[PDB]
Ligand SMILES: [Ca+2]
Ligand SMILES: [Ca+2]
């Protein structure tokens with residue numbers, strides 16, 4: 001990810017809302033999926049100011065570079081080789097850390113000695129059980145955070161797993177991502193571009209309307225992107 | 228540093244007291260300098276329990292691998308490539324972070340592109356002004372935290388700065404160190420050994436009574452080191 005662009009994202013338990021992490025700040029967006037009533041609810045503002053529990057930690061100093069909602073008001077956040085499980089309390093505004101900060105390889109042992117050990121580019125919550133897809137360069141992992149294991153017991157290339165990404169900028173990786181409130185729809189970001197994808201746990205599907213520009217799709221981000 | 232051995236140390240504002248950092252825990256010690264009557268004041272205890280402002284940080288998780296006092300009830304602490312200025316508030320147990328957690332080359336930018344950038348081995352407070360000696364492998368630096376600069380133009384080898392360490396387990400580095408309450412005496416740790424040294428911001432040091440065993444010098448730490 002380059003300066004100013006979306007480096008992390010996750011879906012809120014609050015309907016039709018998502019947190020986007022850029023540099024060392026965040027934006028809370030009502031990304032209005034399936035309509036055009038998008039609006040920025042909060043931000044741009046420092047992670048250290050927004051989520052005070054993160055203020056005097058690595059996440060509050062440097063921001064957050066990968067994430068994904070788990071369940072309820074919880075989400076895993078990453079910065080380089082460290083990660084944390086947080087409660088981002090969207091109603092009470094009373095964020096707390098639940099786990100860590102801990103090295104990725106240690107919260108997720110199966111990642112030790114892989115490309116994810118030193119860091120993760122992007123991730124999103126599967127609709128399926130406790131499954132998660134994570135991306136590092138052109139590689140991706142599918143995990144189960146309840147069993148804390150790799151579902152596909154093998155780390156495979158993105159094109160092997162996302163044919164819709166072949167001959168696109170996403171074939172080689174993503175800046176950030178997040179699962180929509182819209183069942184089985186996923187957003188992938190990369191530079192000033194986004195891909196709205198429809199997935200299905202049976203390997204093969206589609207990009208909806210090709211690769212477009214983030215600010216064309218969400219005019220409310222017009223001069224927030226790049227930051 | 229091998230597991231169970233002293234990984235960091237700094238001198239307390241309270242007379243003849245010091246904090247020794249071992250694994251993910253620490254000991255508070257009346258180390259009794261120039262006299263005897265050593266006594267363990269607290270611990271061993273997880274850093275995350277004794278210092279709660281650090282509980283949910285990389286320090287609470289992994290411990291401290293390098294440190295040095297500055298002035299008052301403050302100190303710089305380290306863990307790999309991250310550091311933080313803390314208030315250990317010895318009178319009240321109400322430690323708080325004052326700065327960081329943050330990358331070393333970030334707080335001390337002259338360490339950028341240096342052997343110090345990825346981590347520091349040991350450090351001690353100079354009696355002179357706001358100077359500090361830091362060691363990594365077999366070399367060391369002399370910085371000033373007031374001007375936040377390097378006093379010594381160049382990173383020098385240990386044997387060059389410390390003749391007394393020639394042909395000693397210390398010329399290849401140390402695990403930990405701290406300045407004594409007793410003027411210009413410094414303690415250096417390596418495995419089960421230690422050198423009590425008489426420095427003098429200059430050229431000619433001397434190891435008082437040779438290299439000895441930590442537990443023979445501090446009988447109180449005898450069922451504790453190694454941990
Ligand atoms: Ca990223
Ligand atoms: Ca050390």
Ligand SMILES: [Cl-]
Pocket residue numbers: 007008009010066067068121122123124176177178
């Ligand atoms: Cl993400």
Ligand SMILES: [Cl-]
Pocket residue numbers: 234235236237293294295348349350351403404405
């Ligand atoms: Cl030290």
Ligand code: NA
Pocket residue numbers: 009010011068069123124125177178179
């Ligand atoms: Na997601």
Ligand code: NA
Pocket residue numbers: 236237238295296350351352404405406
């Ligand atoms: Na010291």
